[PDB]
């Protein structure tokens, strides 16, 4: 019912995310992650810290965050343009089923949800994603969570990018 | 001597490119691809044509091209923003050695080279990349081929993004 | 048809006559990119009588702090700024202006770092009620680096008698 | 003789002040207003009280006072930071001549001059400014009054600001 008490499933192995690539966010909190494609990237072989990278792609715009495991099934993100950190958790994951992948992740501002990302690669047909959104929408600030794929730009021959 | 008669090695399997992720371009033709990270993406599970996607990331800007294999060891690109096509080839590839990956690819304007991209994930240490750049520079328009990683922006805690 | 995708492709309307800006004084920045220009009031100033270069000045006022930039017209409907404190220059443009309407003034202005937006200032004097402003912000947020653009007027310090200053 | 007996010329229309923007203070009492530029601002469109604002700008610092007309050719100020009040008068004004603008204003501690400001946009060439300063100095505490543009910071390419 409040953000700090939401579920926190274990972060799947990185390989499970990469096998899901690319995804799209079906539901998000702020406007930032509307009409967005997610790509996960393994650490560079010469990276000293071996952090993976999450790519949030909206047309010609890209938002990049290295991330690593933290306590309590957290993912600690480092914004690659600013160096600021954010602590994220997974409400649920359901990766690489025979009907594809979905998950919902979130980051808190105390008892408020500061951001929400529900990703899938199956046109939003995972029944888990429905249940999860309904729960998160009732958390403080979660009234803002909305469907993120209405009236997105037209494509020019590519399926996942525009 | 001329672009049309450069080497055309077999395109490696996609998984070889993905296992090399992420790469940087050490030598390019146009300055669009300066200070750039390359990430490859598998086709979306629901994508009708099953085209892979090359991501060309320069700080906060991303260029995306779907691609599929064509005749004569070619890759056919589809710019996701404009819908413009281009036929590309690999001069050589050397992916996933015990010293990492490098390759050089090119597209032609008849006998001149229109674009050149030499990627690696080993700080430019593959012998083959030296040989291959010197050859491509000697072709019509390869005077414009330059080292692409001079004076790039400073990072904020991420290894391969800025 | 489709929004501009990089900062270099944003619209560039004519810089209104200085006098239209001065008649809009003072304005507040509803949306900005860096945090520097949160809780900020804009005042335009004509060139001084004895100004050798006849540059106007934009004042960005945050409580008891001020940032100042001389500006002059440039090619392609640019304004070229000179930071009065550092001598740093920057080429700006207007995404739109809608000054001195029956519902007041708004505009949005920007400066690019190539294809990314480096700074963004949307000002108004009508409590953010201009529909043009809202659509301008949506377009600008979508270019590289535009995700940092944010509402700039939350949790600003308490005033002590004055409407536009604090 | 005494501050309470100084001239009190009419407050010029606000448009006359704004047409004079910007000015510098050639003489002041307190060193607070040394090396200082004056800018006048019209009331905000939605200001309920419709007070104008006087801006005192010294490098990167600014003092702001809302002001309205009051009894006896007075301007009543409201410090925007402190909420504090001052009653000021004009000793003279000489706005928008063919040689530019000048004026001198003052506020009193009874018979002592509390603060004094003489502004101009013509490098202090207005004969009226000379005579008005000479007179102000002979007032109790008017010994403090000094040429205020000695030893001011160097500029970085702007005429009226630093
Ligand atoms: O953007 C959110 C996120 C969450 C977990 C891992 C990577 C990224
Ligand atoms: O059509 C967009 C898209 C992107 C990623 C996954 C699935 C669909
Ligand atoms: O950017 C060029 C390229 C070449 C081959 C495959 C994918 C992309
Ligand atoms: O060679 C290392 C490297 C650096 C940046 C991005 C990708 C790879
Ligand atoms: O501070 C931004 C700016 C832009 C155009 C004109 C004046 C100021
Ligand atoms: O929108 C009105 C306003 C408020 C404070 C300062 C300037 C303008
Ligand atoms: O600071 C002095 C003053 C006097 C009259 C009007 C505005 C300001
Ligand atoms: O350079 C100082 C200055 C400031 C305002 C008006 C005239 C001159
Ligand atoms: Cl996520
Ligand atoms: Cl390539
Ligand atoms: Cl501006
Ligand atoms: Cl004054």
Q: What is the DSSP string of D138-158?
A: TSTTGGG-EES-SSPPPPSS-
Half-sphere exposure in the Cβ direction for A157 (13 Å, CA): 18
Technique behind the model: X-ray
Residue D162 with chain C: CB contacts under 8 Å: 84-85
Tell me if residue B80 falls in helix, strand or coil.
coil
Nearest to B26 by CA among B147, B159, B157: B147
Cα distance between residue B91 and residue B4, in whole Å: 11
CA of D15 to the centre of ligand 11 (A): 24
Return the structure tokens found at A122: 């199956």
Q: Is the CB of C164 under 6 A from ligand 6?
A: yes
What is d(CA A14, CA A42) in angstroms, rounded to the nearest whole number? 7
| C3 part of contact set with chain A, CB < 8 Å | yes
Residues with Cβ–ion distance below 5 A, ligand 10: B 105, 117
User: What is the spatial distance between Cα C111 and Cα C91, in angstroms, rounded to a whole number?
Assistant: 6
Answer yes or no: are the C-beta atoms of B152 and B162 closer than 8 Å: yes
Chain A meets chain D (3+ C-beta pairs below 8 A) = no
Report how far residue B146's alpha carbon sits from residue B144's, in angstroms, rounded to the nearest whole number.
6
- Are the beta carbons of A104 and A133 closer than 8 angstroms? yes
- Chain B nearest-CA distance from C133, in A, is 24
Sign of the Cα torsion C128, C28, C56, C73 reads: negative
How many Å apart are CA B57 and CA B48, to the nearest integer?
Answer: 25
Hey, whose CA ends up nearest to atom 2 of ligand 8?
D160
Q: Closest Cα partner for D119 from D47, D59, D54? A: D54
Q: Which chains would you list as touching C if contact means 3+ CB atom pairs under 8 Å?
A: A, B, D
Residue C82: list chain D partners with CB under 8 A.
156-158
Residues in chain C after which the chain is broken, C→N over 2.5 Å: none
- Could you tell me which of D74, D77, D75, D123 has the C-alpha nearest to residue D102? D123
Q: Which residues pair with B117 in a beta bridge?
A: B28, B105
Yes or no: say if C21 and C45 are a contact pair by the CB < 8 Å rule. no
User: How buried is residue C41: exposed, middle or buried, by Cβ count under 10 Å (0-12/13-18/19+)?
Assistant: buried
Residues 30-59 of D with CB under 8 A from C: 39, 41-49, 51, 53, 55, 57, 59
Q: Which-ligand-closest: CA of C68?
A: 5
Alpha helices (H) in D50-118, listed in sequence order: none
Residue C49 CA, closest ligand 8 atom number: 7
> Atom 6 in ligand 1: which residue has the minimum CA distance?
A75
Which are the contacts of D12, defined by CB distance < 8 A and separation ≥ 6? D90, D93, D95
Q: Which two tokens stand for residue A12?
A: 């799947």
Name the domain count of chain D.
Answer: 1
Q: How far is the CA of A112 from the centre of ligand 7 (A)?
A: 47
Domain that holds residue A17: 1-162
DSSP labels, D110-137:
TTEEEEEEEEESSTT--HHHHHHHHHHH
Tell whether ligand 3 has an atom less than 6 A from the beta carbon of residue B75: yes
Task: Please name the residue of chain A whose CA is at the shortest distance from the CA of residue B159.
Answer: A47
Closest ligand to C-alpha of residue B37 is: 4
The DSSP secondary structure of C88-145, one letter per residue, reads: -EEEEEEEEEEEEETTEEEEEEEEEETTEEEEEEEEESSTT--HHHHHHHHHHHTSTT
- Helix then strand then coil, % of chain B, to nearest 5: 15, 40, 40
CA distance B149 to B162: 13
Residues 6 or more apart whose Cβ sits within 8 Å of residue C33: C117, C118, C119, C120, C145, C146, C148, C149, C150
* Nearest Cα residue to C83 out of C65, C66, C108: C66
Is the Cα dihedral A29, A32, A37, A38 positive or negative?
negative
**8-state DSSP, D31:** G
Q: Which chains touch D (3 or more CB pairs under 8 A)?
A: C
Rounded to the nearest 10°, the torsion over CA C14, C15, C20, C21 is 150
Specify the length of chain D in residues: 162
- Is B45–A161 a contact, with Cβ atoms under 8 angstroms apart? no
Ligand 3: does its nearest atom lie under 6 Å from the Cβ of B132?
Answer: no
**Pick from D60, D66, D158: which is nearest to C57 by CB?**
D158
């Amino acid at each position: 019912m409040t953000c700090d008490k939401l579920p926190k499933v274990p972060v799947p192995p990185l390989e499970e995310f990469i096998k899901s690539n690319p995804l799209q966010f079906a539901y998000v909190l702020t406007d930032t992650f509307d009409c967005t494609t997610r790509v996960y990237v393994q650490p560079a072989r010469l990276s000293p810290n071996q952090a993976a990278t999450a790519l949030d792609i909206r047309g010609s715009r890209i938002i990049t965050n290295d991330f690593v495991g933290g306590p309590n099934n957290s993912a600690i993100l480092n914004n690659c343009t600013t160096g600021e950190k954010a602590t994220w958790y997974f409400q649920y994951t359901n990766l690489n089923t025979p009907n594809g992948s979905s998950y919902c992740a979130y980051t808190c501002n105390g008892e408020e949800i500061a951001e929400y990302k529900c990703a899938n690669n199956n046109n939003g047909t995972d029944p888990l994603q429905k249940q999860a959104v309904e729960v998160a929408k009732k958390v403080p600030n979660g009234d803002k969570i909305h469907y993120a794929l209405d009236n997105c730009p037209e494509h020019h021959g590519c399926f996942a990018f525009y």
